[model samples]
Target: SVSEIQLMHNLGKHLNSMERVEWLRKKLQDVHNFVALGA
Candidate 1:
């Protein structure tokens, strides 16, 4: 899980709508990093 490793945030069990959106945004950024940077 991307969040399990280092997401620069806790993203705890209590993820509000805004927090959830942020979480997903970070996840996408993370994926982009991997893709753009390679693996």
Candidate 2:
């Protein structure tokens, strides 16, 4: 549950604030996805 793919859109709000979109359904153990833009 790590879906912050794209939200670099900065205008005024602190976050996507209002449309509300920040999901992090924690479940990562043997971490190995430092492939950057490929992971």
Candidate 3:
């Protein structure tokens, strides 16, 4: 199974700079939540 981090990385590849920044910002919050849960 692909991890969320890997999934985010793969998904980011096709994003434009502007969208990628926003996408990454949102994903960073999600990633932080996952980390907080010790996943």
Candidate 4:
């Protein structure tokens, strides 16, 4: 659970970065890029 906790911590720290949000938003735009993507 340590990794999960660290991941969540990083997520929270960057939660207010508009540019980072846009980066994630754009990644979601590419459907082909997400299919069967590894966990």
Q: Which 10 successive residues of model 4 have the least lDDT summed?
A: 1-10
Residue-level lDDT of model 1, residues 6-28, one tens digit each, is: 33354545556555787787788
TM-score ranking from best candidate downward: 3, 1, 4, 2
Regions of candidate 2 where Cα sits further than 4 Å from its true position:
8-15, 18-39
- The TM-score measured for candidate 4 stands at 0.36
Best by lDDT: 3
Q: State every prediction's TM-score relative to the real structure.
A: 0.46, 0.14, 0.47, 0.36
Clashes of each: 0, 0, 0, 0
* Cα deviation of 27, candidate 2, in Å: 37
Better of 2 and 3 by TM-score: 3
lDDT of 1: 0.62
Give a tens-digit lDDT track for model 4, residues 1-39: 254455456764555465468666767767546686443
In the predicted model 4, the residue pairs found to clash are none
Q: After superposition, how far is residue 27 of candidate 4 from its true place, in Å?
A: 0.4
Error of 2 at 9 (Å): 6.6
Residue by residue across 1-39, what tens digits does model 2's lDDT show? 545334445422335643234322111211334333332
lDDT of 3 at 36: 83
